[PDB]
Amino acid sequence: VQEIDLGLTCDMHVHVREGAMCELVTPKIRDGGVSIAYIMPNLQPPITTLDRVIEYKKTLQKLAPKTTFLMSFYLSKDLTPDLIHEAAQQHAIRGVKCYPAGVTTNSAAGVDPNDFSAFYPIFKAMQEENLVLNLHGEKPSVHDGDKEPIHVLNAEEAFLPALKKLHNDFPNLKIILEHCTSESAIKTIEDINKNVKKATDVKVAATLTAHHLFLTIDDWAGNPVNFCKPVAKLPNDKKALVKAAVSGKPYFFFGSDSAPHPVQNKANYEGVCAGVYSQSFAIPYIAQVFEEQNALENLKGFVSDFGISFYEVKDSEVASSDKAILFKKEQVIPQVISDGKDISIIPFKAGDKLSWSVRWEPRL
Amino acid sequence: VQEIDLGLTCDMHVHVREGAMCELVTPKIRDGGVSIAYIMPNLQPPITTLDRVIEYKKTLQKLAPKTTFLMSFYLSKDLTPDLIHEAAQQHAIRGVKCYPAGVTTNSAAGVDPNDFSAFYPIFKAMQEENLVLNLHGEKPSVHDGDKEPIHVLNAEEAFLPALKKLHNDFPNLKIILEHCTSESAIKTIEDINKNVKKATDVKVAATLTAHHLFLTIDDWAGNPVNFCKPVAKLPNDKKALVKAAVSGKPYFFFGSDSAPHPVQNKANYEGVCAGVYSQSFAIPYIAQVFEEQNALENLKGFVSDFGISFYEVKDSEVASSDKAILFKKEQVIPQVISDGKDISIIPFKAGDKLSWSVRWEPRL
Numbered sequence: 001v002q003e004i005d006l007g008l009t010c011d012m013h014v015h016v017r018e019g020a021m022c023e024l025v026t027p028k029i030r031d032g033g034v035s036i037a038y039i040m041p042n043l044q045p046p047i048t049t050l051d052r053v054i055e056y057k058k059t060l061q062k063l064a065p066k067t068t069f070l071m072s073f074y075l076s077k078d079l080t081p082d083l084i085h086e087a088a089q090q091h092a093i094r095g096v097k098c099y100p101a102g103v104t105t106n107s108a109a110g111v112d113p114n115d116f117s118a119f120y121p122i123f124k125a126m127q128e129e130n131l132v133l134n135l136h137g138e139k140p141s142v143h144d145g146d147k148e149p150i151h152v153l154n155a156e157e158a159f160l161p162a163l164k165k166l167h168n169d170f171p172n173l174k175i176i177l178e179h180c181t182s183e184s185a186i187k188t189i190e191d192i193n194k195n196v197k198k199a200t201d202v203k204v205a206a207t208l209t210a211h212h213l214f215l216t217i218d219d220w221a222g223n224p225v226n227f228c229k230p231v232a233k234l235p236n237d238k239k240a241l242v243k244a245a246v247s248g249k250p251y252f253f254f255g256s257d258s259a260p261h262p263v264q265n266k267a268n269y270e271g272v273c274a275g276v277y278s279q280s281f282a283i284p285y286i287a288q289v290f291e292e293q294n295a296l297e298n299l300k301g302f303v304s305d306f307g308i309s310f311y312e313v314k315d316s317e318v319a320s321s322d323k324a325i326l327f328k329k330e331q332v333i334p335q336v337i338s339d340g341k342d343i344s345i346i347p348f349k350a351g352d353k354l355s356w357s358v359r360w361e362p363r364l
Numbered sequence: 365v366q367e368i369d370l371g372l373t374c375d376m377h378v379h380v381r382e383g384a385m386c387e388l389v390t391p392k393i394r395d396g397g398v399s400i401a402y403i404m405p406n407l408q409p410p411i412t413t414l415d416r417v418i419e420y421k422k423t424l425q426k427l428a429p430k431t432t433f434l435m436s437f438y439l440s441k442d443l444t445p446d447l448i449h450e451a452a453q454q455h456a457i458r459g460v461k462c463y464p465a466g467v468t469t470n471s472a473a474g475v476d477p478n479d480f481s482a483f484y485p486i487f488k489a490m491q492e493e494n495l496v497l498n499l500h501g502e503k504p505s506v507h508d509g510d511k512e513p514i515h516v517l518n519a520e521e522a523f524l525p526a527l528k529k530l531h532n533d534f535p536n537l538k539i540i541l542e543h544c545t546s547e548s549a550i551k552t553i554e555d556i557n558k559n560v561k562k563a564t565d566v567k568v569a570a571t572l573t574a575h576h577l578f579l580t581i582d583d584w585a586g587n588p589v590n591f592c593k594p595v596a597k598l599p600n601d602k603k604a605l606v607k608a609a610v611s612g613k614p615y616f617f618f619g620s621d622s623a624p625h626p627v628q629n630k631a632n633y634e635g636v637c638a639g640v641y642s643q644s645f646a647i648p649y650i651a652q653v654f655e656e657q658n659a660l661e662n663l664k665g666f667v668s669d670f671g672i673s674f675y676e677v678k679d680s681e682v683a684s685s686d687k688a689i690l691f692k693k694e695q696v697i698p699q700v701i702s703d704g705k706d707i708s709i710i711p712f713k714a715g716d717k718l719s720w721s722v723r724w725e726p727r728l
């Protein structure tokens with residue numbers, strides 16, 4: 001069928017930017033089909049204060065008034081358990097995002113996942129205030145010639161033990177294994193969620209991006225535009241990610257990980273910035289996967305329903321109650337997304353065609 | 365300083381592409397410490413005609429008079445047994461290199477390896493002319509089908525059945541599995557040469573590069589300058605290559621994969637032409653690995669002896685009797701290698717220190 005009403009769409013993994021790069025991307029949340037988003041904190045400096053996250057939401061509300069924004073804090077060595085509480089009652093944040101040290105862009109100020117003990121007073125504060133824990137699951141690279149060599153392939157699988165220890169020590173804490181990329185990570189989410197069903201018994205969930213449903217290792221090997229973290233893994237891994245996405249289970253929903261960089265950052269011969277931009281056509285990308293699997297009925301759950309049930313998004317928090325209408329008009333993906341002065345992005349599947357577009361329609 | 369006499373070193377994997385690139389990198393074979401070179405024909409257009417390979421060889425002898433060149437043909441449909449016999453009788457080449465379609469750059473005008481049968485007439489003429497069948501071992505990538513999907517990491521392993529068949533069908537045909545990158549490929553070479561004593565009894569050998577002894581998958585992940593085809597693999601695979609290089613076995617000798625590309629070709633955001641440049645410090649790259657493994661008494665055999673005994677290099681064909689002499693003088697790798705006009709190459713491990721350097725000393 002065409003003209004599917006998805007309602008209030010949820011993209012609970014969003015990197016927009018600061019600056020003029022932010023003025024170009026923040027409207028594209030509306031134009032990508034997303035109504036409710038989740039802004040990540042990895043900036044320069046990292047968002048670790050109450051004043052910064054309030055003015056960062058103050059700016060995004062001006063650039064996109066109709067978009068509903070949920071902010072986050074950077075898990076760093078400057079956070080305090082009293083800051084977590086003071087930011088919670090003020091309703092200035094919606095969760096915390098953890099970056100391992102030196103695994104992605106702006107993650108140098110991150111943490112060491114081998115010893116999470118220093119950040120247990122912080123996680124105890126989130127469990128009381130009912131916040132969300134975002135986990136970029138990837139152990140740092142270890143050659144070492146002695147212990148299990150960690151690389152970009154087995155980085156997510158090696159993080160799974162740390163995920164089960166964080167779930168065991170904080171059973172009530174809502175934790176998300178963002179951007180699952182392997183099959184071992186999927187079976188772990190299937191394992192922790194043994195017999196939980198309906199919508200809200202899920203305490204540990206996982207978000208699946210738009211590019212990880214398409215990309216394999218053969219794609220970004222010579223194409224730095226597709227290179228992101230965690231890297232796209234084998235087809236056997238992509239097989240599980242597609243099945244888990246069209247699964248219709250409540251512990252899987254949509255987090256795009258749209259990380260826009262200028263094209264001069266990708267066109268490097270080393271030190272290429274990882275990230276894939278898919279914000280301008282966020283929902284259209286997912287509609288093509290759900291049509292290939294003939295599972296267009298689960299598109300409402302994965303994109304809209306499950307992201308609202310986990311974060312418990314309320315009707316009073318929504319900025320503009322406009323529903324997303326997914327109509328089937330073919331569109332071409334431009335070769336470049338430019339702001340007109342100096343910024344240039346290469347969107348995901350730049351040049352390819354899509355089966356779907358998306359407009360907006362108000363609740364009457 | 366400590367010194368080593370290597371005699372006539374050998375590098376049976378060299379790419380000297382036409383133009384100003386050729387006039388620049390051709391002398392650098394002698395700068396790396398190599399006296400005998402085997403030129404791979406992935407030109408545009410590829411080398412399939414007799415006048416092409418006679419004109420291309422004299423171009424190299426003019427650029428470097430003291431370097432011995434062993435030429436080759438591109439395995440295409442445009443080859444006939446009459447052309448193979450005539451070229452071999454005129455001492456034009458010493459074998460033909462094959463490229464699976466869509467596995468490297470300038471491979472597109474190549475073959476499909478899971479058939480390999482239409483080229484049996486060519487292999488018959490070579491098996492009678494005692495030429496060398498060099499293979500780029502990688503099955504082209506396919507993701508869907510009833511068979512196991514093929515990607516950049518398993519492509520070398522999936523080709524191994526076709527290698528055994530080409531050795532089983534043509535037992536007395538000298539075959540080389542070029543640029544081994546996986547442990548599975550090394551074990552196959554060891555088992556094919558199980559009963560082998562008296563090295564001259566080797567029919568299937570394998571050339572090992574200088575960069576695949578250092579590089580892993582994390583070294584090129586986000587670093588296009590180290591991106592080559594067959595791609596760098598897991599640390600377990602690297603150990604097997606290192607052990608094989610220092611093993612001192614006859615069926616393992618040196619093939620550099622000196623694929624030179626201008627820096628603008630490597631710093632793309634899509635379609636990064638693969639290949640690492642190691643010509644300028646070919647032997648110093650290898651001597652560092654052999655010193656780091658303490659197996660320096662085998663270095664004379666890996667780079668010099670086992671390539672001569674396999675390719676049957678006689679003293680009459682050698683262009684210069686000057687022996688390559690190592691000497692323990694620490695040096696630095698430049699940032700760029702440039703002809704001075706329009707070309708800028710990024711050498712391997714640009715900006716590192718090596719323990720050795722290469723001079724040359726006449727015979728007796």
Ligand SMILES: CC1=CC(=O)c2c(O)cccc2C1=O
Pocket residue numbers: 377379404406468469543592593594621622623624637638639
């Ligand atoms: C252009 C190019 C790519 C390339 O990948 C390559 C290789 O893996 C081994 C030897 C030579 C080459 C080469 O010349």
Ligand SMILES: [Zn+2]
Pocket residue numbers: 104136229230
């Ligand atoms: Zn990330």
Ligand SMILES: [Zn+2]
Pocket residue numbers: 013015040257258259
């Ligand atoms: Zn992210």
Ligand SMILES: [Zn+2]
Pocket residue numbers: 468500593594
């Ligand atoms: Zn090659």
Ligand SMILES: [Zn+2]
Pocket residue numbers: 377379404621
């Ligand atoms: Zn080659």
